Amino acid sequence: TRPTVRPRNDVAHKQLSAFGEYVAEILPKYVQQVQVSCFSELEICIHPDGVIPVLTFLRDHSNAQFKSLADLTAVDIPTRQNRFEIVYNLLSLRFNSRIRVKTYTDELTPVESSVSVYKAANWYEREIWDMFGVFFANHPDLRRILTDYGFEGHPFRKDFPLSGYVELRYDDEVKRVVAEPVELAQEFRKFDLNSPWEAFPAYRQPPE
């Protein structure tokens, strides 16, 4: 078990467990999950109303500094009514630790636009608005950045397929470039690789 399998530290696990229990006790208004994985990186799962209060707490308080802001994405999970998952990622300059603030959200109701306390979140929020459509009320400027202007569809969803619906070509008829419905030259074959036989017995969900 020891060679070529990465060992761990239970000490960091106990530290993050006690810290997450502490944060869960002292902000009871929005805490739903505080989960700790095997390799000690914290996850805090949050209702979509305490975005500004929880981030104003987590920027400060001298027990959890966490100035460094990272990724924002809202992992598209169907079979839910609240589809999208806004994932804040926070890194502490003072304590060297990573916490993942996963707040949940639906298709049409906005979360509260974290750019007010995080100046790094501006183009992150603009990117999420362009690729998904998660609206951000009380935001300075929402535009389409990382897509074409005349293109729409919010393509990083699961409803948007791999190929786009439109496809450009130049033509000398109207002496310019026009978009057409997509005419693929090949299929993009689909390999049914989801093999049976239960490779992980621990992660079995209870069937009906």
Site for another protein in 130-169 (CB under 8 A): 133, 135, 137, 142-150, 152-165, 167, 169
Residue 66 beta carbon to another protein: minimum distance, rounded to whole angstroms: 10
Residue 88 C-beta: closest distance to another protein, Å: 12
CB of 113 to another protein, least distance (A): 13
Q: Give the residue, chosen from 51, 88, 100, 101, that forms a contact with another protein under the rule CB under 8 A.
A: 100
* Window 13-52: residues binding another protein (CB under 8 A): 15-22, 24-39, 41-43, 45, 47, 49-50
Pick from 80, 125, 132, 134 the residue near another protein by CB under 8 A: 80
Binding of another protein by 10 (CB under 8 A): no
What is the spatial distance between Cα 170 and Cα 177, in angstroms, rounded to a whole number? Answer: 4
φ/ψ of 70, rounded to 5, equals -145, -165
E strands along 42-83, which residues?
Answer: 42-46, 68-70
Task: For residue 165, give the nearest of 177, 148, 180 by alpha carbon.
Answer: 180
Task: Say whether residue 60 binds another protein (CB under 8 A).
Answer: yes
- DSSP one-letter code for 115: G
106-125 in b/e form (b: 16+ CB < 10 A) is: eeeeebbbbbeebeebeebb
